[PDB]
Ligand binder design. Structure first.
Ligand SMILES: CCCCCCCCCCCCCCCCCC(=O)OC[C@H](COP(=O)([O-])OCC(O)COP(=O)([O-])OC[C@@H](COC(=O)CCCCCCCCCCCCCCCCC)OC(=O)CCCCCCCCCCCCCCCCC)OC(=O)CCCCCCCCCCCCCCCCC
Ligand SMILES: CCCCCCCCCCCCCCCCCC(=O)OC[C@H](COP(=O)([O-])OCC[N+](C)(C)C)OC(=O)CCCCCCCCCCCCCCCCC
Ligand code: SF4
Ligand code: SF4
Ligand code: SF4
Ligand code: SF4
Ligand code: SF4
Ligand SMILES: [Zn+2]
Lengths: 145, 207, 45, 360, 100, 114, 178, 114, 125, 94, 112
């Protein structure tokens, strides 16, 4: 990617949606990639997240003020590349390059989903998922994370 | 035109490349994998048993008067079975060229000394031993040059922790400086900075 | 407005002395023996 | 009082900089180099800057090069001033050390004005220079330069034709030309013997190829001839400043390549890509392509070279530093043969040694 | 500028060379501490058009070290004697102060 | 198998060097304790020399033993001359560190160590 | 181009006058009385010394000294816990443990700098995208115990409710260069 | 007529009689170069250099034009190169570099990066 | 010449590591998992080698995290698993290896999103 | 806006205080626990909420390069008031 | 000038009152610094100068640096910086002089 900007105009902003106590939606920084929409309607089966409008105004989110709460709802944090929607408990607590990644496993359920317990100076900061194609196919529940 | 990209004087690439081959076929018994980098610097890899003949040749030969030993470093690479890759940088003062000579070693595979050829190696030659534990044959003195008189270790090895295993402090019970195992007040913070994206496609390693 | 960047003034600066300048000083070489011997002979008298 | 054997036990200042570099990004490791040869401060980081530039395959802008040569010569005057004086302090002539340190203090204002520190200016980044010269600082450098050649003469009067200084320095530390190369000597030690060598005139790395100057060469190898080489280099370095002042082209100070050098503060706060590059260059650091280089520059002590190995990451793999003093002090055994204890004291200085670079 | 002109003569004579025009300490030749605002020039690559990074990306122009006579492969090693470079030219005496 | 030798045809030959280095230390303990004013007596100094050898009596590689002997001679050279002072020689005796326990229950009481 | 420094040009040319000049030089210490002359001149010069407590040596706006956490004119803290001043610090002197402030803002709960680890390199002030941390001109803060050099957010805001009358002028006079 | 009463470098004599030391040394190298195996590259390349520098020594009798024509510095520097090169030929005869490679390197020894 | 040595290579005494970090210490040879927040796979491809984590406690004075072991920060990178194993055995540390977990190639077709009778039909765009 | 804990110690703007029974309070004996009395929660609230005409308003620290990076707020919400993320300023329309 | 405050440099520790530990203190040098500190006749003072001497400074995490001379000698005044400005050390020396200005050693002697 280019190393400088030719933009000389005013950017856009988007109304921010309060869609629950896990995810923190700051939709000004969405790149409208439709990953969250597909994951919601193909893995979690929540089918309550979609686009809206057209043009630059293609806001993504629930049209009405509704709770996007499901057993697999914290995984939207992982899937979204940009920080458009991120976890609330983790909000501002730490940063990646400070954290040490260690391998572990979930014990909150009987499936033993793999885990990356990121610790920063002797304390647990977040519980990320690992890839394992037999159990925990890159997704982990909300209870574990 | 391109003020950012370095000017490329391709003339000195041909000259070095010709000389690398000339050294390759005038000393085949040891020479391995001569190469020239983008930055126009030659690099000859030598079997460890041929350090003296190669270094003696490159100094005395009329067409290669490499009389100045710039430095004698050592790169630790745990990946390869022969870890320590001793490096010799040489300078001419006649043909105005720099040539690198490389050999491999191991913590149980010493290398013949060079103080006979280049006396400059003498102190560099211990520095490698003190820092990497690469014993060198036929050296006169060969003692630690940098580390304390009581390090049971080799600091520059990649398996040596940065903080070390011992700290010094003053004790009144014994009225002298004592050594105790290291207990840092703030642990060194290792930053996982590596990016997960192919910065340089020209160096891809297929699986 | 125009770029101001701390450049040397037009035509550069004045020259800077950079060579050895050790003045030559002292009596002739015979005068200083003449004074010394003259002082030495007048003293004995 | 005759020395039969010298065994320099260096290691009293082994901080272990080379290992601490491997855990630090390229920009993070820059101040390590200001602290190796701590009397030619910003002429060390030039060696680091040139090495990283070579691997990155970038070159600095024309204005930056002149600043790096202009300030690369103030380091030479700074370092030679100490070498002439602290050498004389041990011999006994304390007065010249106090005169010329009224000039070091003047020049340290230039560092404190281009950077913010008197001594360790982390000013010469690989991507050119960190920050532009403040208005009128060239005028102050010029006003310094005019008065300077008078200062060097005042010292030259005191301890250049004295019986006491010539007898304490002539015929001492005679190093044969053949042994100078075999012992790996470089810099003034080579030139004192008679060997014609200077990296600024044989392997140019900056605008040094467009600037004219003379390299002093000595007839005999004694400490006296290489004293004159140090004093005469100040004269020639003071000649480069005249030229750098008189041609300091306008332009940028750092390469316009936001993936290696940071963008300006103003663009950081209005454009997105500039913020991303500012954010990544100061967290991970720019990545240099895998490779190995040995770049050498004519530091005032001599051939200061850095051997950077690298992998496809933001932190180097091995950074060996060819301190010019390592070879000189190793050869101290041969210099002091049939010479008294006081002569050894007069030979430590004539090598112009600091143990930050040796031990490093 | 407070030497009284009789000590100014004594120090000028004793030193051997005039120095009241070349004093160490600075009086009023130094640039004023406060300076007017600058506007540093914007360097190249701010063209805003025809400036694609793929043209002047020097970091990607580096290629792995070219290899000659690789042992792993079977590279092939009347020939004239070769040198690393043409011999360095002998320097010439300086013309300003050849001898000092 | 198939590893070049270093000052050792076989283990027995390298054991002679170790026995040569031991005779160099046993003859040296009574000279360091006096040349540098150590607070130990020669009888217990020789015990530490022997102890530092049993620490490495389980090795059997000829190459390793030669490197151990080479380092020991360097360690001896720095002590024959007074390069290493009382601070360095008394570093072997560990006269300050608390004796780390061995019983599992004692380890369980203090710290999380295995 | 080289330059001979101690090589005689032409020799074997000496007469009684030239011979007697050298005799006068050696036999009456002419070139030692010449060295005394220079020192005698220096006695009749104004010393460069300055009364430190009462007149303090010159500095520059870019000077790098004691640290300081700045605030916006309204009073709000500038630091936003982006934590890339501890990413670039090449001594790991800075530590941050920011959490949300309970009013929604991203602010720090710990900003301790170890001034015994810091090397006064200035990388942290050029990395901060809000100028939250700066380095004022205060070079005189030596202490009588190691502990007072372990600065914490409370000290760093005090240095920053104190030197803003100075810090603002310094930044306002060199930000264009940055 | 001149003899450069002082040479540029220190430790080197003035060598008042050139064109005889050079002819002797270059002739000696050829004789030792004649004992090498014919296929060895050192014999081929070193002959091509010594013979070239032997013609030039016989060509011009003036030394000042010889130093410039024979680009090897002053005559003394050139002579000390013939001696050192002459020493190399003797050492080459015993090391036998022309033989094929011995113990090609292991799988990855020059694979950078890692 | 050459020598015969059937004993496993063992250099624990030469490196001079204290015995307290030879027997007790445990080494983990693994290929680090991709940071699922990002979709790049460059952090992988290199076998790493950490050490068993040890006690970290808050400093009583500042709250910094202070440690009593030197090996915690050390990570060594290897090209292949076999090279890493030799290093572990060669230095006498105990090691355990986690096998590579490479993703299984998947059949992604843009046409399946719009199918006439299957259940893959995507309800949006 | 500094409040004293029941043990008499002063609570900082981060909410910290040492319990009455904590031994780490010794360091303050014969000395003082410096706390900055200019809190940040209170000072930012005392500012007036600015009213603008557009639905998207920029925010920087005020001096341009001396402020914070150029950000854009959305002011369509009426129940709440848009807040700049860097500085705690607030904006409304109408 | 330090001669203004009657401050003169002397090589022998036997004739030195204060010791300015300026520069990185390494393991190899640590035994030497304590020895030299012991030789100074009491009363003696130590003025740790710079980051490398106060704490470990830039080399806090190296294997051969004692993290601050406070581990080897008892320091009276710490002068922060890297390097401290010549004024910064002079403020340290003056602030050391004001330390001796309030000793109270003979006053307590009357109380013993
Ligand atoms: C020997 C004669 C005494 C020295 C003298 O009077 O020569 C003055 C005069 C000083 O000239 P200068 O040093 O180049 O001018 C410096 C400025 O005055 C520098 O500016 P300034 O502001 O310092 O102006 C000088 C002012 C400064 O104010 C002072 O008065 C200095 C403090 C007085 C105590 C010292 O007054 C003086 O210094 C004149 C004081 C005369 C000597 C006082 C002797 C005190 C003896 C006390 C005994 C108890 O020297 C001469 O003309 C005679 C030189 C003969 C020797 C060659
Ligand atoms: C206040 C008191 C001032 C006293 C004078 C101090 C010297 C001032 C410097 C003068 C100078 O610059 O000289 C340059 C010059 C430097 O000379 P030069 O090195 O340039 O010589 C050039 C070549 N020849 C030798 C041919 C002249 O020296 C002189 O002018 C004088 C030198 C002779 C001095 C002889 C002194 C003998 C002392 C013993 C006699 C008794 C003395 C009374 C004792 C009471
Ligand atoms: S995944 Fe993130 S960036 Fe993509 S559409 Fe959803 S919110 Fe926007
Ligand atoms: S970190 Fe990424 S998602 Fe967040 S603001 Fe920057 S570019 Fe956008
Ligand atoms: S000045 Fe440099 S060393 Fe000090 S805290 Fe800032 S970044 Fe770290
Ligand atoms: S001081 Fe600046 S760089 Fe450091 S965390 Fe705060 S905002 Fe970020
Ligand atoms: S100036 Fe800085 S790096 Fe140098 S010794 Fe002092 S604290 Fe250490
Ligand atoms: Zn704002």
């Amino acid at each position: 990617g280019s190393d400088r900007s030719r933009f000389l105009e005013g950017k856009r902003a988007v109304e921010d949606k309060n869609i629950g106590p896990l995810v923190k939606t700051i939709m000004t920084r969405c790149i409208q990639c439709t990953r969250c929409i597909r994951f919601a309607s193909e893995i979690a089966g929540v089918d309550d997240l979609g686009t809206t409008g057209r043009g630059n105004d293609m806001q993504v989110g629930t049209y009405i003020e509704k709770m996007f709460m499901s057993e697999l709802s914290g995984n939207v944090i992982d899937i979204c590349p940009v920080g458009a929607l991120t976890s609330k408990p983790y909000a501002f607590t730490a940063r990646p390059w400070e954290t040490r990644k260690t391998e572990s496993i979930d014990v909150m359920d009987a499936v033993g989903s793999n885990i990356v317990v990121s610790t920063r100076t002797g304390e647990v900061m977040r519980i990320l998922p690992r890839m394992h194609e037999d159990i925990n196919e890159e997704w982990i529940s909300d209870k574990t994370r | 035109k391109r003020p950012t990209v370095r000017p490329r004087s391709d003339v000195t690439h041909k000259q070095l490349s010709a000389f690398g081959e000339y050294v390759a076929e005038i000393l085949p018994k040891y020479v391995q994998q001569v190469q020239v980098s983008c930055l126009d610097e030659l690099e000859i890899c030598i079997h460890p048993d041929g350090v003296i003949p190669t270094l003696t040749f490159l100094r005395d030969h009329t067409n290669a008067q490499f009389k100045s030993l710039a430095d004698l470093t050592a790169v630790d690479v745990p990946t390869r079975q022969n870890r320590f890759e001793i490096v010799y940088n040489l300078l001419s003062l006649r043909f105005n060229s720099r040539i690198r000579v490389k050999t491999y070693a191991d913590e149980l595979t010493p290398i013949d000394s060079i103080v006979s050829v280049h006396i400059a190696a003498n102190w560099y030659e211990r520095e490698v031993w003190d820092m990497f534990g690469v014993f060198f044959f036929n050296h006169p003195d060969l003692r630690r040059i940098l580390t304390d008189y009581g390090f049971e270790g080799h600091p520059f090895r990649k398996d040596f922790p940065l903080t070390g295993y011992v700290e010094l402090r003053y004790d009144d019970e014994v009225k002298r400086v004592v050594a105790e195992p290291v207990e840092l007040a703030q642990e060194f913070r290792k930053f996982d900075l590596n990016s997960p994206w192919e910065a340089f496609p020209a160096y891809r390693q297929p699986p | 407005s125009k770029v101001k960047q701390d450049m040397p003034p037009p035509g550069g600066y004045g020259p800077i002395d950079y060579k050895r300048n050790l003045p030559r000083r002292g009596l002739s070489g015979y005068s200083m023996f003449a004074v010394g011997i003259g002082a030495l002979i007048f003293g004995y008298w | 009082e005759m020395v039969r054997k010298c065994d320099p036990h260096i290691g009293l200042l082994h901080r272990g900089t080379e290992k601490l570099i491997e855990y630090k990004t390229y920009l993070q490791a820059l101040p390590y180099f200001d602290r190796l040869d701590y009397v030619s401060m910003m002429c060390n980081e030039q060696a680091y800057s040139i090495a990283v530039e070579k691997l990155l395959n970038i070159q600095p802008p024309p204005r930056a090069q002149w600043i790096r040569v202009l300030f690369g010569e103030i380091t030479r005057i700074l370092n030679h001033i100490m070498a002439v004086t602290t050498h004389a302090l041990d011999i006994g002539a304390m007065t010249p050390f106090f005169w010329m340190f009224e000039e070091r203090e003047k020049m340290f204002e230039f560092y404190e004005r281009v950077s913010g520190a008197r001594m360790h200016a982390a000013y010469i980044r690989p991507g050119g220079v960190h920050q532009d010269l403040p208005l009128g600082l060239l005028d102050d450098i010029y006003e310094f330069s005019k008065n300077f050649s008078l200062r060097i003469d005042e010292v030259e009067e005191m301890l250049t034709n004295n019986r006491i200084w010539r007898n304490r320095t002539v015929d001492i530390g005679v190093v044969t030309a053949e042994d100078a190369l075999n012992y790996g000597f470089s810099g003034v030690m080579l030139r004192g013997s008679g060997i014609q060598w200077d990296l600024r005139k044989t392997q140019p790395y900056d605008v040094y190829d467009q600037v004219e100057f003379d390299v002093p060469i000595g007839s005999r190898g004694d400490c006296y001839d290489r004293y004159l080489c140090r004093v005469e280099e100040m004269r020639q370095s003071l000649r480069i400043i005249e030229q750098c002042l008189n041609k300091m082209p306008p332009g940028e100070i750092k390469v316009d390549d936001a993936k290696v050098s940071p963008p300006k503060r103003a663009e950081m706060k209005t454009s997105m890509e500039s913020l991303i590059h500012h954010f990544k260059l100061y967290t991970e650091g720019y990545q240099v392509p895998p490779g190995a280089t040995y770049t050498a520059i004519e530091a005032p002590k001599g051939e200061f070279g850095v051997y950077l190995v690298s992998d496809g990451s933001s932190r180097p793999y091995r950074c060996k530093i060819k301190a010019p003093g390592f070879a000189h002090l190793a050869g101290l055994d041969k210099m002091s043969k049939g010479h008294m204890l006081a002569d050894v004291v007069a030979i430590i200085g004539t090598q112009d040694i600091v143990f930050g670079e040796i031990d490093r | 500028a407070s030497a009284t002109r009789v000590i100014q003569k004594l120090r000028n004579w004793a030193s051997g060379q005039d120095l009241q025009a070349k004093l160490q300490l600075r009086y009023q030749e130094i640039a004023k501490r406060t300076q007017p605002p600058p506007k540093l020039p914007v360097g190249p690559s701010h063209k805003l058009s025809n400036n694609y990074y793929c043209t002047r990306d020097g970091r990607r122009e580096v290629v792995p070290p070219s290899i000659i006579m690789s042992s792993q492969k079977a590279l092939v090693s009347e020939k004239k004697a070769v040198t690393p470079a043409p011999p360095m030219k002998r320097w010439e005496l300086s013309k300003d102060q050849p001898y000092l | 198998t198939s590893v070049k030798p270093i000052f050792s045809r076989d283990l027995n030959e390298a054991k002679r060097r170790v026995r040569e280095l031991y005779r160099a230390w046993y003859r040296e303990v009574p000279n360091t304790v006096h040349l540098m004013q150590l607070d130990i007596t020669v009888k217990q100094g020789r015990d530490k020399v022997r102890e530092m050898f049993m620490k490495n009596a389980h090795v059997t590689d000829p190459r390793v033993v030669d490197l151990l002997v080479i380092k020991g001679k360097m360690e001896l050279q720095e002590t024959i001359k007074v390069w290493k002072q009382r601070t360095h020689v008394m570093r072997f005796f560990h006269e300050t560190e608390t004796p780390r326990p061995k019983d599992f229950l004692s380890k369980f009481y203090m710290g999380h160590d295995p | 181009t080289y330059k001979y420094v101690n090589k005689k040009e032409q020799e074997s040319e000496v007469d009684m006058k030239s011979a007697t000049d050298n005799a006068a030089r050696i036999l009456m210490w002419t070139e030692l009385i010449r060295g005394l002359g220079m020192t005698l001149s220096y006695l009749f010069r104004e010393p460069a010394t300055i009364n430190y407590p009462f007149e303090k040596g010159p500095l520059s706006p870019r000077f790098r000294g004691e640290h300081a956490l700045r605030r916006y004119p309204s009073g709000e803290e500038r630091c936003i816990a982006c934590k890339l001043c501890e990413a670039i610090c090449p001594a790991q002197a800075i530590t941050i443990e920011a959490e949300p402030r309970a009013d929604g803002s991203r602010r720090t709960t710990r900003y301790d700098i170890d001034m015994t680890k810091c090397i006064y390199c200035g990388f942290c002030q050029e990395a901060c995208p809000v100028d939250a941390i700066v380095e004022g001109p205060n070079f005189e803060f030596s202490t009588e115990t190691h502990e007072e050099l372990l600065y914490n957010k409370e000290k760093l805001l005090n240095n920053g409710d104190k030197w803003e009358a100075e810090i603002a002028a310094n930044i306002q006079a060199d930000y264009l260069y940055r | 007529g001149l003899l450069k009463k002082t040479t540029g470098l220190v430790g080197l004599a003035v060598c008042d009689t050139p064109h005889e030391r050079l002819t002797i040394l270059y002739t000696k190298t050829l004789d030792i170069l004649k004992h090498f195996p014919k296929h060895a590259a050192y014999r081929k390349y070193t002959e091509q250099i010594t013979n070239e520098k032997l013609d030039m020594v016989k060509a011009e009798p003036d030394v000042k034009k010889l130093e410039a024509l024979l680009q090897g510095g002053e005559v003394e520097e050139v002579i000390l190169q013939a001696e050192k090169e002459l020493s190399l030929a003797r050492k080459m005869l015993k090391w036998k570099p022309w033989e094929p490679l011995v113990e090609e390197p292991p799988a990855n020894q020059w694979k950078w990066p890692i | 010449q050459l020598i015969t040595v059937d004993e496993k290579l063992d250099i624990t005494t030469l490196t001079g590591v204290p015995e307290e970090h030879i027997k007790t210490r445990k080494v983990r040879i693994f290929v680090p998992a991709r940071n699922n927040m990002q979709s790049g796979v460059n952090n992988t491809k290199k076998w790493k080698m950490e050490f068993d984590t040890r006690e970290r406690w808050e400093n009583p004075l500042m709250g910094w995290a202070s440690t009593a072991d030197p090996l915690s920060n050390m990570v060594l990178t290897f090209s292949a698993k076999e090279d890493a194993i030799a290093f572990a055995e060669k230095n006498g540390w105990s090691y355990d290896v986690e096998e590579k977990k490479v993703p299984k190639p998947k059949s992604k077709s843009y046409g399946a999103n719009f199918s006439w009778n299957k259940r893959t039909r995507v309800s949006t765009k | 806006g500094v409040q004293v804990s029941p043990s008499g110690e002063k609570i900082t703007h981060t909410g910290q205080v040492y319990d009455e029974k904590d031994y780490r309070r010794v360091r303050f004996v014969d000395r003082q626990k410096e706390v900055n009395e200019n809190f940040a929660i209170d000072l930012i609230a005392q500012q007036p909420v600015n009213e603008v005409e557009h639905r998207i308003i920029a925010c920087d620290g005020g001096g341009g390069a001396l402020g914070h990076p150029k950000v854009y707020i959305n002011l369509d919400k009426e129940t709440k008031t848009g807040t700049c993320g860097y500085c705690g300023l607030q904006f409304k329309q109408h | 000038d330090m001669d203004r405050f009657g401050v003169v440099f002397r090589a022998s520790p036997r004739q030195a009152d204060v010791m300015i530990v300026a520069g990185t203190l390494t393991n190899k040098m640590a035994p030497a610094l304590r020895k030299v500190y012991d030789q100074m006749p009491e009363p003696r003072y130590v003025v740790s100068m710079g980051s490398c001497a106060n704490g470990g400074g830039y080399y806090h995490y190296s294997y051969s640096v004692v993290r601050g001379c406070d581990r080897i000698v008892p320091v009276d005044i710490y002068v922060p910086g890297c390097p401290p400005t010549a004024e910064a050390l002079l403020y340290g020396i003056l602030q050391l002089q004001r330390k001796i200005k309030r000793e109270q050693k003979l006053k307590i002697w009357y109380r013993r």
